[PDB]
Ligand binder design. Structure first.
Ligand code: WDO
Length: 134
């Protein structure tokens, strides 16, 4: 058993709050916000050795990142930002920091009851997204 066992599996989006405002703060344009905001992604998390893979799949976009905790990687986000990312575990929470153009956003993923709860923060704006097992 290991690090991220409680995260592994297939998850489906069940609620979102303030996601449009989070995307606005990040710089996402109108049409992308509208289509991205409609999406009901599945999130698929797997672990093989030290390598964690997170896939997001929806009618809007399919994305995939693979990484080792604490080891920076380059990421193209769903809204086409080219960012440098680092993901760590901090007290059982996966903490994902993305840096680009002198800006920074943090996405936190944690297990709470039978849910996977995602908090996205850009400056003073937070969005919360709740996933359940598929
Ligand atoms: O659902 S959560 O894992 C999750 C994944 C990524 C994310 O950041 C986005 C997503 C879409 C756009 Cl268009 C811009 C930024 C926010 C939440």
């Amino acid at each position: 058993s290991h690090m991220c066992d409680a995260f592994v599996g297939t998850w489906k989006l069940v609620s979102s709050e303030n996601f449009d405002d989070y995307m606005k703060e990040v710089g996402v344009g109108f049409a992308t916000r509208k289509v991205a905001g409609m999406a009901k992604p599945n999130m698929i998390i797997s672990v093989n050795g030290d390598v964690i893979t997170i896939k997001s799949e929806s009618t809007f976009k399919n994305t995939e990142i693979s990484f080792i905790l604490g080891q920076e990687f380059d990421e193209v986000t769903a809204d086409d930002r080219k960012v440098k990312s680092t993901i760590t575990l901090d007290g059982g929470v996966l903490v994902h920091v993305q840096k680009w153009d002198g800006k920074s956003t943090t996405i936190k993923r944690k297990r709470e009851d039978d849910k996977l709860v995602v908090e996205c923060v850009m400056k003073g704006v937070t969005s919360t997204r709740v996933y359940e097992r598929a």
